[PDB]
Amino acid sequence: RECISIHVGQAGVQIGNACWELYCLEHGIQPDGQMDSFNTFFSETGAGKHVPRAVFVDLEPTVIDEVRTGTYRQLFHPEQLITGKEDAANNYARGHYTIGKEIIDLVLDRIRKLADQCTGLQGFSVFHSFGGGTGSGFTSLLMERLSVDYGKKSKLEFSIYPAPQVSTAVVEPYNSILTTHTTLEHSDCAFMVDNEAIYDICRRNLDIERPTYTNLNRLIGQIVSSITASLRFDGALNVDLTEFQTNLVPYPRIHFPLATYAPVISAEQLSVAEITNACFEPANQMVKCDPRHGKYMACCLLYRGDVVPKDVNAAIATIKTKRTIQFVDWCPTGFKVGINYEPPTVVPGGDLAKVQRAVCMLSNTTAIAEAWARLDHKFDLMYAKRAFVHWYVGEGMEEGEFSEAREDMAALEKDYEEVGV
Amino acid sequence: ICVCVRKRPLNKQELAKKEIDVISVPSKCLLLVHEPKLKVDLTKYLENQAFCFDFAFDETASNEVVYRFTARPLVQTIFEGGKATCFAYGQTGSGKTHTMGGDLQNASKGIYAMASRDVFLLKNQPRYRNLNLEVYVTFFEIYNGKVFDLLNKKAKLRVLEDSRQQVQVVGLQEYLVTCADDVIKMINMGSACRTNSSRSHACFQILLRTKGRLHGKFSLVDLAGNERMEGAEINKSLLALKECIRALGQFRESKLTQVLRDSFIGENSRTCMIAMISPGISSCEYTLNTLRYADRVKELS
Amino acid sequence: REIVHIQAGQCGNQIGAKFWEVISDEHGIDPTGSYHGDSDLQLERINVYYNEAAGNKYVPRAILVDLEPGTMDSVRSGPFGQIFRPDNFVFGQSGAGNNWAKGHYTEGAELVDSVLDVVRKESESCDCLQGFQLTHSLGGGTGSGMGTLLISKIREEYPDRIMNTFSVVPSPKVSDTVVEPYNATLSVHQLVENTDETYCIDNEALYDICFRTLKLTTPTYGDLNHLVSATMSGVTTCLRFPGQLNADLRKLAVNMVPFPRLHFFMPGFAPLTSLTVPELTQQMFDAKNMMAACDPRHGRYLTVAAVFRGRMSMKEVDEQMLNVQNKNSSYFVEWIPNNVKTAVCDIPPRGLKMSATFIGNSTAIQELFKRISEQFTAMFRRKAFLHWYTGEGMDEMEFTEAESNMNDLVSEYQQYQDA
Ligand SMILES: Nc1nc2c(ncn2[C@@H]2O[C@H](COP(=O)(O)OP(=O)(O)OP(=O)(O)O)[C@@H](O)[C@H]2O)c(=O)[nH]1
Ligand SMILES: Nc1ncnc2c1ncn2[C@@H]1O[C@H](COP(=O)(O)OP(=O)(O)NP(=O)(O)O)[C@@H](O)[C@H]1O
Numbered sequence A: 001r002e003c004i005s006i007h008v009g010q011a012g013v014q015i016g017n018a019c020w021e022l023y024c025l026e027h028g029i030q031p032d033g034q035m036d037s038f039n040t041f042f043s044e045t046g047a048g049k050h051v052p053r054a055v056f057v058d059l060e061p062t063v064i065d066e067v068r069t070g071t072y073r074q075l076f077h078p079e080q081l082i083t084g085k086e087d088a089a090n091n092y093a094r095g096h097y098t099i100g101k102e103i104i105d106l107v108l109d110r111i112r113k114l115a116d117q118c119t120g121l122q123g124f125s126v127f128h129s130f131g132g133g134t135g136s137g138f139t140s141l142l143m144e145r146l147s148v149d150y151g152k153k154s155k156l157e158f159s160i161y162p163a164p165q166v167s168t169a170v171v172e173p174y175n176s177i178l179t180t181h182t183t184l185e186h187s188d189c190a191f192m193v194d195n196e197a198i199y200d201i202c203r204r205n206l207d208i209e210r211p212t213y214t215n216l217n218r219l220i221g222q223i224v225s226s227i228t229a230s231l232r233f234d235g236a237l238n239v240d241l242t243e244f245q246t247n248l249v250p251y252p253r254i255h256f257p258l259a260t261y262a263p264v265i266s267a268e269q270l271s272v273a274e275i276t277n278a279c280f281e282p283a284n285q286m287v288k289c290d291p292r293h294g295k296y297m298a299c300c301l302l303y304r305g306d307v308v309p310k311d312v313n314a315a316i317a318t319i320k321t322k323r324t325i326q327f328v329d330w331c332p333t334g335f336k337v338g339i340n341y342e343p344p345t346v347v348p349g350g351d352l353a354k355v356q357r358a359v360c361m362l363s364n365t366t367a368i369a370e371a372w373a374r375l376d377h378k379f380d381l382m383y384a385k386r387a388f389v390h391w392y393v394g395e396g397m398e399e400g401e402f403s404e405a406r407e408d409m410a411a412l413e414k415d416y417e418e419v420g421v
Numbered sequence B: 001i002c003v004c005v006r007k008r009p010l011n012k013q014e015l016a017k018k019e020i021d022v023i024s025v026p027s028k029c030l031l032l033v034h035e036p037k038l039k040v041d042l043t044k045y046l047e048n049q050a051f052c053f054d055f056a057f058d059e060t061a062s063n064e065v066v067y068r069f070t071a072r073p074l075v076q077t078i079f080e081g082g083k084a085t086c087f088a089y090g091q092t093g094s095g096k097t098h099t100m101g102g103d104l105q106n107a108s109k110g111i112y113a114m115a116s117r118d119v120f121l122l123k124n125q126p127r128y129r130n131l132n133l134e135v136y137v138t139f140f141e142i143y144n145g146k147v148f149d150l151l152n153k154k155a156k157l158r159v160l161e162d163s164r165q166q167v168q169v170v171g172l173q174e175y176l177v178t179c180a181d182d183v184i185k186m187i188n189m190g191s192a193c194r195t196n197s198s199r200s201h202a203c204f205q206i207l208l209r210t211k212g213r214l215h216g217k218f219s220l221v222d223l224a225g226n227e228r229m230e231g232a233e234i235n236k237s238l239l240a241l242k243e244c245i246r247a248l249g250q251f252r253e254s255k256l257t258q259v260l261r262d263s264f265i266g267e268n269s270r271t272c273m274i275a276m277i278s279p280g281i282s283s284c285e286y287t288l289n290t291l292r293y294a295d296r297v298k299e300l301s
Numbered sequence C: 001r002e003i004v005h006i007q008a009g010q011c012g013n014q015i016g017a018k019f020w021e022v023i024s025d026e027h028g029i030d031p032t033g034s035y036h037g038d039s040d041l042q043l044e045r046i047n048v049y050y051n052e053a054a055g056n057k058y059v060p061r062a063i064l065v066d067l068e069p070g071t072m073d074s075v076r077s078g079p080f081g082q083i084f085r086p087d088n089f090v091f092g093q094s095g096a097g098n099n100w101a102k103g104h105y106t107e108g109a110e111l112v113d114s115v116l117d118v119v120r121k122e123s124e125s126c127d128c129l130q131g132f133q134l135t136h137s138l139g140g141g142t143g144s145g146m147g148t149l150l151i152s153k154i155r156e157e158y159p160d161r162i163m164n165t166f167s168v169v170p171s172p173k174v175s176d177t178v179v180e181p182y183n184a185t186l187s188v189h190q191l192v193e194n195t196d197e198t199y200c201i202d203n204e205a206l207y208d209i210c211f212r213t214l215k216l217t218t219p220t221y222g223d224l225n226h227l228v229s230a231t232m233s234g235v236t237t238c239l240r241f242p243g244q245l246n247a248d249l250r251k252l253a254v255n256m257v258p259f260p261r262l263h264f265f266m267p268g269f270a271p272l273t274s275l276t277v278p279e280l281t282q283q284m285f286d287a288k289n290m291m292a293a294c295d296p297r298h299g300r301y302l303t304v305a306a307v308f309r310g311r312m313s314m315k316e317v318d319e320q321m322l323n324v325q326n327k328n329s330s331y332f333v334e335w336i337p338n339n340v341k342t343a344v345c346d347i348p349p350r351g352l353k354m355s356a357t358f359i360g361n362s363t364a365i366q367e368l369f370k371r372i373s374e375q376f377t378a379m380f381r382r383k384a385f386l387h388w389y390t391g392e393g394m395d396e397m398e399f400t401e402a403e404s405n406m407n408d409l410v411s412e413y414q415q416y417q418d419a
């Protein structure tokens, strides 16, 4: 039925800022206010306005302040925008303990103020950074507590895996490992987004020498749109969360599906068979790695626009003939195909053009663990000397919690590899 | 698989009604049925039929003698870690309960008791002492596809079977016994609240356990008469039993065969079938039916 | 002597709706009105499928069940929407399911009584009740889960009379849910225990017939239902029509099912899509023409029952019908004597000048059970989407208990390819 969006911390906020704008454009809601189906994400407030079911939280104003500034200012309620004066400082230990504690009760209560006008809520979609102050810290704490106040209700996280070039912070790897540990036993399914992969797609495709955040976010916007879409329009693909995940995660170990967007092509018609063909192409992923190496244990195809199954079929047939199928031992050959006739609308001054048809493909491969390694190594190697640990012990964390968390990442990397044939 | 037949003597009622005894057992493996017949012209004659079994017992054979050549040789099987089953099969009033449970009443004089007696004797033998086993007993009856714990006041139990297919009887009560007198107390208790007369399947079990694991198990079964349409469940179980036993030396399931499934699937499993026969001329058709069923069972050996 | 018809869950409702409007025009019945058509027969046994009310009117003895309005109002504002008795519809309102559990325990039980209490009215109204027949799907849940429940509760109130079902067994192609195998297996078990005869309409078979042999590209749920709907009229003909047999439906049972375990029939139809006789038999006995994904070759027939249709000479039929179990005389179990019976009726179906239909209790059906048990143990392996049921109240071992019962059914059918 219903569906709350939560955006915590800079990356979280800005990403959502850009996909709540693609949402509006998709459903045609003039910023100001007005124009079920569209109801999954909005609450028809007042006798005009349309307003989102979202909450934005950051531990410094800055980011949120620009939201209450640029158009869309009217779009939200003043309450759904929570801000916190003192910064997260860039260390989980602060976001999860010291500085968080102070704002958790006020957020927690407001999101419940939102869930109250929702006859039979469904779950939360949460957007946050992997490394990064409050993105790691506060998130982790939110999720712990959301699990206390909302037993069943699923939690779908949209995480941003950090990458050297689209500037990180030295301590980033600590933060990532840290949150992903606590946060793991509390999420149902999470969508990782490698900032290197998106920086990468903006280069090979959009042809931008210096990709901005505002440039990256736009693209991510689209991937997210295509992911939710199904449950916004409505009678189409992955209906009512649950049957969304029941489709991708075979094991409680929160599995992170690998996302691949269809045709990304700059402004200023691609064949149904061709875009599917571009979906089994590493250069177009969302997490830098490669599944021609690992195995697949559940494939998903989410189309949008002008498409008849008649082709989608013949495109699959030929997509297996001269390709690396490599499906895993004990699991069918998935391919829950979903088509959503509603065409892919893109932002007006955007860098990508209108497209006749687009695909999405969400696969849960074992090769996604190649990213869990790339992070562990960084962490392991710094921790080898307590590199920056003292800043965390400083806010009140135990040196043990650092072990205890990497300890899980050692385990996860094992599980992932263990699923192989 | 071992198949035997036991003829019971004519009882008071039958002798009084002047019932003719039409059964002879001239040797330890041969049973003769002197079947009365009439030619078309009404002339009386005998079609004397012969059946051969591993062991054929006459009317003078006591329960101890019968026990010695049927269930006794199976006790060792459970100490060797196998699964043994002994079935008493035949018509209503043929001697099934008398043989397995005691004369009638007297538990000690029946196969359940005698088998228990030898289980305690063997466990104390050097070759088995070091096994450090504990002896457990169970007593349940199957009536219309339903299982009832006779040691837990006819409590109706549930029978489940995963996908791997082993069966489990949820709630069946296992009682620790350390003496034959113990076993005799559980047999009296169970027989006291059983649904004499058939209508059910009786099954008294002797289990051997050491450490969380089952070492061996012996299931002694007192079957329902082989001769209100519940006879359909009884006939299906008997048909199912036959195929399970034959499958041992090489469906259309029923409760009985579902519960005893694990005792026919293992490679280290033995079974003995004892066919009870009422010697009276009036029961000749029931006898032939019992004997032919028996023939097909041993046919797999 | 007289039968009531329960019809539940989106698929069932749609399937049966076509059945109804198909036999109704066979008998010559208006959306409400009565007879109209120069035929005279029809009305003899119209009794059997139609409790008749006020004035002329005919109103079918049908109960409509679902756990979400939509599908029902699809019928009402549809083909013969006006035909069914108003308070005979039983709405659900709440969440559907598409998860067995919900329909056989939580959201299911909720309704049961209000339906049971309406079947109870129809039944007790019957002059001499013959039994019930229900249509539903085995995959999904608002009819595969409430249905198997509805029937578990009909026996108990009606051990007496017999239970008949047309159940659509689902496939990997043309399916809405990843869970179907769970829903399927969970019902198959139930059917085995409380029904006398069950017809298997495999959707895999169904799709194959439309595209693999009918040039029909995208198979709607529409031209697909047209197959099932035509088949269902063929299968019942002898109980709704002449004065050749009469069909106690119990006679049909006692004669088609040699073994208790309710044996499942694979049906087959003669001409098709939306006919010499030798040409008709050759087709009606062809795998390429069965309603279940099987292939009687990889298995013998226990008993077969065939029913022709249209003005044709039985002299030829009895001749050709012998000529099949001759050129194929190895595939008819020889431990059951005259195990293949044929009935002829002379009132043509829709279009079709000639027609035939086929009912087969064949050990090849084993093939079908094996393939759903293949995706089941293939998912219940590393306990898949299972937490969706655990949650609605079910126990982990109630799955193994179903799986176990089901494989036996395979291990029994495979036991009877004996001698
Ligand atoms: N894709 C994307 N990544 C971002 C964006 N903004 C920051 N990041 C990334 O997010 C990570 C840092 O997270 P932050 O949002 O700055 O951390 P935060 O604590 O949540 O926010 P602050 O309180 O401002 O420190 C790094 O991986 C950055 O590359 C954005 O707008 N889009
Ligand atoms: N070998 C035997 N010697 C003396 N009496 C016997 C013998 N076998 C059976 N009887 C008696 O004959 C009757 C049959 O007993 P049991 O009670 O043994 O029958 P089933 O158990 O054969 N009958 P049922 O329960 O009806 O299927 C009882 O009264 C026994 O005491």
Ligand SMILES: COc1cc2c(c(OC)c1OC)-c1ccc(OC)c(=O)cc1[C@@H](NC(=O)CS)CC2
Pocket (backbone or CB within 6 Å): A166, A167, A168, A169, A170
């Ligand atoms: C006083 O203002 C400064 C503040 C900071 C940084 C810095 O050095 C470039 C400054 O200039 C002197 C800074 C520093 C250090 C880092 O590691 C060496 C880092 O990763 C990152 C940074 C700066 N942040 C970033 O580059 C985020 S993408 C933020 C903290």
Ligand SMILES: Nc1nc2c(ncn2[C@@H]2O[C@H](COP(=O)(O)OP(=O)(O)O)[C@@H](O)[C@H]2O)c(=O)[nH]1
Pocket (backbone or CB within 6 Å): C008, C009, C010, C011, C012, C014, C015, C096, C097, C098, C137, C138, C139, C140, C141, C142, C143, C144, C145, C168, C170, C171, C174, C175, C176, C177, C180, C203, C206, C221, C224, C225, C228
């Ligand atoms: N042929 C036939 N099969 C159907 C139809 N609708 C659904 N099915 C099949 O039946 C299964 C479940 O049907 P559904 O009606 O959605 O389940 P319900 O919630 O119990 O009503 C699906 O997996 C399909 O394979 C139908 O219209 N006709």
Ligand SMILES: [Mg+2]
Pocket (backbone or CB within 6 Å): A087, A088, A089, A090, A091, A132, A133, A134, A135
């Ligand atoms: Mg921060």
Ligand SMILES: [Mg+2]
Pocket (backbone or CB within 6 Å): B096, B097, B098, B196, B197, B198, B222
């Ligand atoms: Mg007895």
